[PDB]
From a paper:
We chose TtgR, a ligand-inducible aTF belonging to the diverse TetR-like protein family, as a target for computational engineering of ligand specificity. TtgR is a 1-component transcriptional system and represents the simplest molecular mechanism for converting biophysical interaction between inducer and protein into a complex biological response like transcription. When induced, ligand-binding allosterically lowers affinity for DNA, thereby allowing transcription. TtgR is a compact, dimeric, all-helical transcription factor with a large cavity between five angled helices forming the ligand-binding pocket.
To understand the structural basis of TtgR-ligand interactions, we solved high-resolution crystal structures of quadruple mutant (resveratrol-bound and apo) and wild-type TtgR (resveratrol-bound) at a resolution of 1.9 Å or better. From the enriched population, we isolated a resveratrol-specific TtgR variant with four mutations: C137I, I141W, M167L, and F168Y which we will henceforth refer to as the ‘quadruple mutant’. All four mutations were in close proximity to the ligand and no mutations were found elsewhere on TtgR. The quadruple mutant gave 92- and 6.5-fold induction with 100 μM resveratrol and 1 mM naringenin, respectively, compared to 55- and 55-fold of wild-type TtgR. The DNA-binding domains of the resveratrol-bound quadruple mutant and the resveratrol-bound wild type are extremely similar with an all-atom RMSD of 1.0 Å. The four mutations do not substantially change the volume of the pocket (215Å3 in wild type compared to 234 Å3 in the quadruple mutant) or the surface area of the pocket (184 Å in wild type compared to 186 Å in the quadruple mutant). The biological effects of these mutations are further validated by the crystal structures. The four mutations localize to one face of the binding pocket, making nonpolar interactions with the ligand.
Numbering used by the authors:
A (entry chain B): 5 to 211
B (entry chain A): 6 to 211
The structure:
Amino acid sequence: RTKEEAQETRAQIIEAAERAFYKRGVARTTLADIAELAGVTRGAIYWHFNNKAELVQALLDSLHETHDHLARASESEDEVDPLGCMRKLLLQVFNELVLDARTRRINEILHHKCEFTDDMCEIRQQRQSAVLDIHKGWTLALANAVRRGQLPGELDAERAAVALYAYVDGLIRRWLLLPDSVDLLGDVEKWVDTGLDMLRLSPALRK
Amino acid sequence: TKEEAQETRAQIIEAAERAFYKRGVARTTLADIAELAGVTRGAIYWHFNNKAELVQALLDSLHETHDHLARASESEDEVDPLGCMRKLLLQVFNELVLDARTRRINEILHHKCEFTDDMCEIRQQRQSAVLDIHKGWTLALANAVRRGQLPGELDAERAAVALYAYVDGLIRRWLLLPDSVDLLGDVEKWVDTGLDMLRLSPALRK
Ligand SMILES: [Mg+2]
Ligand SMILES: [Mg+2]
């Protein structure tokens, strides 16, 4: 069928884009390069994607799927243990980064093999949107945890969400750069609780 | 003469910041930078063997302003090593927000510089630079432990990693979304939030 064959083609393109961007970077890779790696025609790849920026976004967008269940739970005001949902969420983020070759490779592309240039302004714009989306969700989950007595009552939820994101994002990039400097999988619980401890203990994050 | 060459080097590095910031590192060549700087007859290749050496020069330049406080925090004779670390981090954030050159170089290194194994040196040099920072921060935190400023059972190495993750992440976050985080007005609070992680989290203790 048309759709089944089209989904298969799009999937081949995306897998080849991961391979191309990881080895040679986003800047110098072309859609024609990716089509040759995927074994599809140039008419096919350009039918699925208009430019490289759309292929980068497809990889970026693919990262949230695994975590959607725990994210929504943490953000629900009816959830009785919102902080516990955040802890399970962060454990899953790190566990997937270490174990999944795809998650690791996409993260490496976004962090270390993809430049922000006004020649391709959409890459930076869409990164801004993704990070703001995460911020909005984490601010809600932290406020819920405050409401349930799991975090300090005077916590600045917004600054707390920024502090947590900084730590998590910085540890991901540090592990990608020096994977042997950090036993992210074996000590994963310790790395998660270090971040949460910052939020629930530091008086600098309170109003 | 000696000053002619030191001037020419500075002209090149300043043009490299302009070229890398506009077009990124991957697609910028030493030839492009030379024309942008206006230095002729192959002079740029006298100063830099390749583009990765130029990139390292930009990164190396970030350590200069903080060297006094970094060396102090690491000295065994320093009686206030954690206070040195606080002053170090305050200055890092103050310079990042206030200094156009520091901000632009950080944006280049964080957001406009690909690691490609055709240019394997860029990644390798970044690894060595972050390992150097980690060695120094581990020593400064160990000094703070010795001086009773941090918990005796602190895992100095993991604490240095945790602090770096936070600082590095906060810099990148501010570069991406500067209007979200008043890094300058609230600088003391952003610093103390990270230091509080080390002072208070039982998860960083051995
Ligand atoms: Mg996933
Ligand atoms: Mg400086």
